[PDB]
């Protein structure tokens, strides 16, 4: 997150860190949202390959023992069948990870609440992106979970030529684009939490930014619209 502030430890208990085996250790590579004690929702491009993954829930500082983490392996990955690695702009950037064991819920570990299917937020709706992604374009990962206020940019505006044009689809949510705050590498797969009827719910799965940089004025961070996949999500969980 560029332009973020450190989140309090218990503000975003559904946020997870998806890590892959690197050398003799584990390396954070993407964010995710715990949606069942044994299922994590993330971006398909994060799990599109042949890497070995573990999920860390209750994580705050990637480089220090928080005394709250649970580590768990990923037993099965279900990527959206329509996901095309060669065209992230086509959409379907979402995958579900079935965890080897159910994690235990507590103030650091909770299920992310999902919006009702079909929900599209009014322009400028209040949301927050969270993650350990880069703190500057071409910079380094944050050590502690960061958050940044990123109001939505509705489809009509997001799809206009000075913004994302044809690149954005209605199956996505655009948020931010203020030139200062944005998602950045390592935030992919993470939640966009939006306040609706007094409850924060996860309306987006972090997907992409401008080739020009993370915080680029009028190139809001783009997310997969969670509300477009509620039936898909429920069908996967019901069958695995």
């Amino acid at each position: 997150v560029v332009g973020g502030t450190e989140a309090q430890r218990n503000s975003w208990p559904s946020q997870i860190s998806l890590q892959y085996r690197s050398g003799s250790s584990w390396a954070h590579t993407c964010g995710g949202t715990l949606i069942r004690q044994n299922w994590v929702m993330t971006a398909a491009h994060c799990v599109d390959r042949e890497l070995t993954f573990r999920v860390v829930v209750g994580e705050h500082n990637l480089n220090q023992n928080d005394g709250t983490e649970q580590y768990v392996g990923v037993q099965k990955i279900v990527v959206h069948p329509y996901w095309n690695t060669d065209d992230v702009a086509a959409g379907y950037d979402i995958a579900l990870l079935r965890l080897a064991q159910s994690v235990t819920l507590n103030s650091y570990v909770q299920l992310g609440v999902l919006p009702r299917a079909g929900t599209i937020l009014a322009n400028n709706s209040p949301c927050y992106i969270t993650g350990w992604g880069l703190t500057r374009t071409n910079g380094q990962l944050a050590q502690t979970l960061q958050q940044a206020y990123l109001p939505t940019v509705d489809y009509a505006i997001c799809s206009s030529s000075s913004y994302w044009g044809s690149t954005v689809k209605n199956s996505m949510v655009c948020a931010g684009g203020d030139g200062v705050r944005s998602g950045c590498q390592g935030d992919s797969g993470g939640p966009l939490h939006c306040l609706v009827n007094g409850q924060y719910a996860v309306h987006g799965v972090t997907s992409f930014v401008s080739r020009l940089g993370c915080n680029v004025t009028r190139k809001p961070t783009v997310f997969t619209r969670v509300s477009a996949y509620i039936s898909w999500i429920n069908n996967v969980i019901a069958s695995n």
């Binding site: 993407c30 994060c46 797969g189 992409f208 401008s210």
Partner: peptide, 11 residues
């Protein structure tokens, strides 16, 4: 550009 670390094409 997708937001996987180090990159989409390079973990």
């Amino acid at each position: 550009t997708t937001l996987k670390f180090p990159s989409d094409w390079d973990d």
